[PDB]
Design a protein around this ligand. Sequence first.
Ligand SMILES: C[n+]1cn([C@@H]2O[C@H](COP(=O)(O)OP(=O)(O)OP(=O)(O)OC[C@H]3O[C@@H](n4cnc5c(=O)[nH]c(N)nc54)[C@H](O)[C@@H]3O)[C@@H](O)[C@H]2O)c2nc(N)[nH]c(=O)c21
Length: 263
Amino acid sequence: ETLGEKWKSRLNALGKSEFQIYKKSGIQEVDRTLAKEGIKRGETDHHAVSRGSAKLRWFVERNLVTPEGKVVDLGCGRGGWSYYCGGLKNVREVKGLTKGGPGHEEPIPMSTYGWNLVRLQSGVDVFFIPPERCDTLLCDIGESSPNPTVEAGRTLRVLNLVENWLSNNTQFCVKVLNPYMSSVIEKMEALQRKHGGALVRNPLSRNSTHEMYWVSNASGNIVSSVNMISRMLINRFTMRHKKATYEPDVDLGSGTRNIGIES
Ligand SMILES: C[n+]1cn([C@@H]2O[C@H](COP(=O)(O)OP(=O)(O)OP(=O)(O)OC[C@H]3O[C@@H](n4cnc5c(=O)[nH]c(N)nc54)[C@H](O)[C@@H]3O)[C@@H](O)[C@H]2O)c2nc(N)[nH]c(=O)c21
């Protein structure tokens, strides 16, 4: 087996209370109380709609993706990645497509900064629509499963989807749900030879997932980068000072493009 599969079965064997502790041990968290109370309150101004905005921020601050021009947000739920992109300097347009109806996250309308560049459509299944052209491609799709062979296919699906949307110079940040299964590893090698980039681990991800992000502006051997994260997660099984480290939430501004309080 892979180290990843080994991690997955060990994780799946944990007691209920032990699992809870492992999930958040030594990770980064976003401080979200006041932003969530505000949203529940009807406010539409400064708040990220999910912890997803801060998640994307991590990549963008480090130039692992540089969202520019026409941004397509494939599978965008409440819109966390989309609204975040709407407040960015080089972004002209943001199209977020999502399935979202019942049992799924419906797009929340917001008046955060650059909201007017942001078009969010529900009732759409991205897997069976034709690829529009774009400058930035984003996809955070991937529902995790205790069965890693289920995960591996979901990941392969998603990797096949984004492949169809990628032209020569697209900037991209695509979630790789389960990167440790060999069929996925293989697909990733093909894709990296084709489109470049590498897999990177986001400190805000929980220890209960092996997700890594294929981001356009990095490099590294695929296998080495996965095993690295496999080892880390395995190390964290036996960990001491357990509290997560917190981070303030993103402040997305308010109002229209230049006039207009920024983020
Ligand atoms: C809850 N849970 C998950 N795993 C593992 O971590 C991954 C990410 O889950 P997650 O809940 O962190 O990610 P979500 O996307 O929120 O999953 P969400 O769909 O909201 O709900 C949790 C998922 O895990 C499953 N699950 C719930 N309770 C258990 C459990 O006690 N044991 C196992 N093996 N699976 C569980 C459940 O069927 C569902 O697919 C999962 O795919 C599991 O491998 C758990 N492992 C142990 N030992 N005990 C648990 O309580 C447990």
